[model samples]
Target: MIVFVRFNSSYGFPVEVDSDTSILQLKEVVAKQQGVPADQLRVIFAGKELPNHLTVQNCDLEQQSIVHIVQRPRRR
Candidate 1:
């Protein structure tokens, strides 16, 4: 399955994932796609934490759905 994910309302990308895909796995893919580190990326949906334990189906996600992605602040 494929879904559309947006980054801080700035950039968007289509991600191919499965219903059993883990949140961390998605984050890793998103991070690579965005050229950022997984730890530096946060995926938000319905204003929730979007736990890694949750899969695509568990997260209530579907094809063409949108997930908000944010870049973490720098330590410096």
Candidate 2:
């Protein structure tokens, strides 16, 4: 259940996870792979800010699909 994660346009990383994995859990994996804290990442798909409780299956992700990772703004 590995998913494609595109960090901006310059980098892309594969994240091994299950479809039942929560967004928060995915964040943890992304954080570890990207060397960034989970709190600093904002995972988005289909123009939506994925909810923490949402599962990968619920997010409708497919293999090679990009889960855009952006830095979370500090003030808001």
Candidate 3:
């Protein structure tokens, strides 16, 4: 099934994703679609480290998923 993920970014591309893909995979897909690098991307689910064992196989992402894509870096 196809699911819509609201991306909070300046990119003008759709953030909707497939429910069959994993979060890790989704990160890569988002990166390609939004012109970002997979390495510089981070997909955090909830307030903890995203689980690698979790997937979209039978679960639909909740409305307004807490996803933040940092296009730049941080400085001290």
Best by lDDT: 1
- Most TM-score-accurate candidate: 1
Candidate 3 structure quality by residue, lDDT tens digits, 1-76? 4443335554323455555567777677767777777666665544544443457654445534545444335343
Give per-residue CA lDDT, model 2, range 1-76, as digits (tens). Answer: 7676776567667877777888888788768877889889888887888878998788787666668887776564
Candidate no. 1 TM-score:
0.76
Candidate 1, 1-76: lDDT as tens digits: 8877887567568888898888888888878877998888877876776866789888778877778877788564
In lDDT terms, how accurate is model 2? Answer: 0.78
RMSD of each: 2.5, 2.7, 4.1
Best first by lDDT, ranked? 1, 2, 3
Q: How does model 3 fare in lDDT?
A: 0.55
| Residue ranges of candidate 1 with Cα displaced over 4 Å | 8-11, 74-76
Better of 1 and 2 by lDDT: 1
TM-score to native of every candidate shown: 0.76, 0.74, 0.50
lDDT of 2 at 24: 86
RMSD of 2: 2.7
Off by over 4 Å in 2: 74-76
Predictions ranked by TM-score, top down? 1, 2, 3
